[PDB]
Amino acid sequence: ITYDYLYFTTLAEAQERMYDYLAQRDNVSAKELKNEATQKFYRDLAAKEIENGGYKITTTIDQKIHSAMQSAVADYGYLLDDGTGRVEVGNVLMDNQTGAILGFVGGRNYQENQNNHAFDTKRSPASTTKPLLAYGIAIDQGLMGSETILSNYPTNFANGNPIMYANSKGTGMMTLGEALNYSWNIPAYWTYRMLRENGVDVKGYMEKMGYEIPEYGIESLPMGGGIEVTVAQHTNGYQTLANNGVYHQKHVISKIEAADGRVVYEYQDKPVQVYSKATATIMQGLLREVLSSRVTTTFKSNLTSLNPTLANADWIGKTGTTNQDENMWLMLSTPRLTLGGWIGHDDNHSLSQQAGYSNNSNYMAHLVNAIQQASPSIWGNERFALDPSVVKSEVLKSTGQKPGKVSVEGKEVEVTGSTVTSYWANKSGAPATSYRFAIGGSDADYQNAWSSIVG
Ligand SMILES: [Cl-]
C-alpha cells in the first residue's frame, strides 16, 4: 500500500481487484463464477494473495491531505453534535479531472464505530438530487434556462398529501435561481414531472455517472425519494457537473503490481460527456449562488472567517435535506476538486432542523481549511466560466420568456416589463412568452400569476 478506515478501505478494494485478476488468470468461466462456493474460494484466495504476496498497491490517496482530514474530524467533529446524540459523518475529496479520491473521512472515530460512512453506507441524497436529476437534465434537454420560472404554488402528491418544505405548503412563481437557493421542493417535483411527460431518458444520464436507482416512477425522486447512495458515489455526480459535464469514474486504487512488475490491475480512464458543457457551466453559475446566498448553508461565512483568501476561490455547491431531517448533505466544488459531505445517525433517527444549515457547514469549512493548509494549491484559484456554446436570451423577469403578446382569458395583452439575460443550453434559446410560461402550475395558479403580472 503506497499513496484505520484507510487501511480497510484500501485493502477491501484491492481484494476485489485481485479477485477479478485471479478468476481471469485461472480461466474461471463466467458461469462457474456464478457458483457461490467458487466465489467464496476466490474471495479468500484474493485475501491470502495480498496478505503475503508482496504486491505493490498504488492508491490515489494524498498522505498529507488525508492525514489532515483525519486530524480535522478528530478535533472538530464535536462541532457536528447538535443535541440529537452523537452525529456521524462521511466525506470524500475527489479530483475533478480524474475521479481520483485524494482523501476521505469514514466517521467520527473508527475505534468507536467501524461503519465507513464514506464508502459503504448508502443514504438518501435528499435535495442534492435536484441539480443532477431534475434541473440539470431539463436544461440539457433545452426545456429550461437559468432564469426560467417555476411554480412553487401549493400542490399535492397523487394521494392528496401536500408537498411540503418544512412547515410551508408553498408560495408562488419563482426563478430557477430562487428555487435552487432555497431548495424549494414543489418546483423540483414539477420539473421531474415535465421530464417524464417529455419522455426524457433520465435513467440514461444517471447510469452514465454510476447511479443505481431501481425505480424512476416516483413522485419524490427529485427530493431523493427512492434513492440511496454512498458519499463516494454522490461526490462523483458533483464531480461531473464541476468538470464541465465530463464524468470520470471514482477510484482509490490506481494500480496493483506483482513484486516482479507484472501489472495485476490498472485503472483505465473512460470519460463521458454526461451533460453538455453549456448545461454544466450554467449549473455551475447557479450553484455558485446557492452558496453565496447563504440561504440553506452558512458555509461561505464560516470559511471567510477561517481563511478569507481560500473563501475567495470559486466555490459552488448544494445542500441536501428533506422534511424527514434524517440526512444532511453539503457538496462543494472548485474547478479542481469536489468535496462531498453527509451527516446523520446510523439508526436514522432525526437530526436537528439546522444541523445541515449550521453545524455541517461550519465543520466542512474547518475540513476545507485543513485540506488547504496541508496542500496550499490543491483547491486552485481557477474560475468556473460559461462555455462559449451557451446561448443567451433576453427574457422578461416575470415570465422567464421573451416579451410578446399573450391571450389572458380574453383580450390580447401585450406582456412587457423589466428583462434579464437567461442562459440556455439549446440552439434557439428562450421561447416567446406563452400563457403557461412556467414549469408546473394549476389553472388557478396561472390566473393568480397573470393577475399580478398584468396588475
Ligand atoms: Cl483513516
Measured in angstroms, the resolution is 1.9
Distance 315 CA to ligand 1 centre (A): 26
* Ligand 1 centroid distance, CA of 332 (Å): 21
Q: How many CB atoms lie within 10 A of CB 199?
A: 7
- Tell me how far the alpha carbon of residue 103 lies from the centroid of ligand 1, in angstroms: 9
Q: How was this structure determined?
A: X-ray
Grid coordinates representing 253 are 486504487
- The angle subtended at Cα 76 by Cα 75 and Cα 79, nearest 5°, is 140
**Strand order in 56-59's β-sheet?**
56-59, 253-257, 263-266
Q: How far is the CA of 229 from the centre of ligand 1 (A)?
A: 21
CA distances from 335 to 140, 347, 447 (A): 20, 35, 43
Cα of 83 to ligand 1 centre, how many Å?
A: 26
SS (H, E, C) the chain: CCCCHHHHHHHHHHHHHHHHHHHHHCCCCCCCCCCHHHHHHHHHHHHHHHHCCCCEEEECCCHHHHHHHHHHHHHHHHHHCCCCCCCEEEEEEEECCCCEEEEEECCCCCCCCCCCCCCCCCECCHHHHHHHHHHHHHHHCCCCCCCCEEECCCCECCCCCECCECCECCCCEEEHHHHHHHCCCHHHHHHHHHHHHCCCCHHHHHHHCCCCCCCCCCCCHHHCCCCCECHHHHHHHHHHHHCCCEECCCECEEEEECCCCCEEEECCCCCEECCCHHHHHHHHHHHHHHHHCCCCCCHHHHHHHHCHHHHCCCCEEEEECCCCCCEEEEEEECCCEEEEEEEECCCCCCCCCCHHHHHHHHHHHHHHHHHHHHCCCCCCCCCCCCCCCCEEEEEECCCCCECEEEECCCCEEEECCCEEEEEECCCCCCCECCCCCCECCCHHHHHHHHHHHHC
Q: What are the CA-CA distances from residue 22 to residues 15, 18, 49, 50, 312 (Å)?
A: 10, 6, 9, 12, 49
How close is the Cα of 106 to the center of ligand 1, in Å? 7
Contact by Cβ (8 Å): 91, 69: yes
Distances (CA, A) of 324 to 38, 157, 166, 298, 436: 43, 16, 9, 21, 32
Q: Determine contact, residues 427/400, Cβ cutoff 8 Å.
A: no
- C-alpha 228 to ligand 1 mean position (Å): 23
CA 55 / ligand 1 centre spacing (Å): 21
**d(Cα 270, Cα 333) in Å, to the nearest integer?**
21
Q: How far is the CA of 69 from the centre of ligand 1 (A)?
A: 9
As given in the structure block, the three cell numbers for residue 47 are: 485475501
CA geometry: angle at 287 spanning 229 and 453, to 5°? 120
Residue type, 402: K
Cα within 13 Å of Cα(163), Cβ side: 23
Q: Measured in angstroms, how far is the CA atom of residue 70 from the centroid of ligand 1?
A: 6
Ligand 1 mean position to 155 CA, how many Å? Answer: 46
Task: Specify the domain boundaries for CATH 3.40.50.12800 within the chain.
Answer: 390-455
Give distance in angstroms: CA of 207 to centre of ligand 1. 29
As residues whose CB is below 5 A from the ion ligand 1, the structure lists 5-6
Is the distance from CB of 154 to CB of 185 less than 8 angstroms? Answer: no
C-alpha 135 to ligand 1 mean position (Å): 35
Closest C-alpha to 285, from 234, 333, 228? 333
Integer CA distances (angstroms), 75 to 68, 183, 454, in order: 11, 31, 57
Q: Residue 356 in contact with residue 366, Cβ under 8 Å?
A: no
C-alpha span between 90 and 16 (Å, rounded): 22
Closest CA to 319 of 344, 347, 299: 299
Question: How far, in Å, is the centroid of ligand 1 from the Cα of 76?
Answer: 16
Q: How far is the CA of 179 from the centre of ligand 1 (A)?
A: 37
Ligand 1 centre and the CA of 219: distance in Å?
A: 38
Give burial (CB, 10 Å; 0-12/13-18/19+) of 451: exposed
* Residue 364, all three cell numbers: 466542512
Fold of 62-251+268-389: Beta-lactamase (3.40.710)
CA of 4 to the centre of ligand 1 (A): 5
- 112 CA from centroid of ligand 1 (Å): 13
Task: Say if CB 90 and CB 117 are below 8 A apart.
Answer: yes
| Grid-cell match 499513496, residue found | 3
Q: Which residues pair with 413 in a beta bridge?
A: 406
Among candidates 93, 88, 90, 98, which has minimal Cα distance to 64?
93
Angle between helices 361-374 and 299-306 (to 10 degrees): 40
CB-CB contact of 139 with 333 (8 Å): no
Angle, helices 63-76/361-374, rounded to nearest 10 degrees = 150
Please state which of the four CATH numbers 3.90.1310.40, 3.30.70.3450, 3.40.50.970, 3.80.10.10 is assigned to the domain occupying 1-61+252-267: 3.90.1310.40
Compute the distance between CA of residue 13 and CA of residue 7 in angstroms, rounded to an integer. Answer: 10
Range(s) of the chain covered by CATH 3.90.1310.40: 1-61+252-267
Which part of the chain has CATH 3.40.710.10? 62-251+268-389
Nearest to 437 by CA among 170, 188, 41, 150: 150
Could you tell me the distance, in angstroms and rounded to a whole number, from the CA of residue 9 to the centre of ligand 1? 9
CA distance 393 to 177: 16
Number of Cβ atoms within 10 Å of the Cβ of 85: 11
Residues 390-455, CATH architecture = 3-Layer(aba) Sandwich (3.40)
Q: From the CA of 113, how far away is ligand 1's center (Å)?
A: 12
Residue 382 Cα, ligand 1 centroid: separation in angstroms?
29
Say which amino acid occupies 64: K
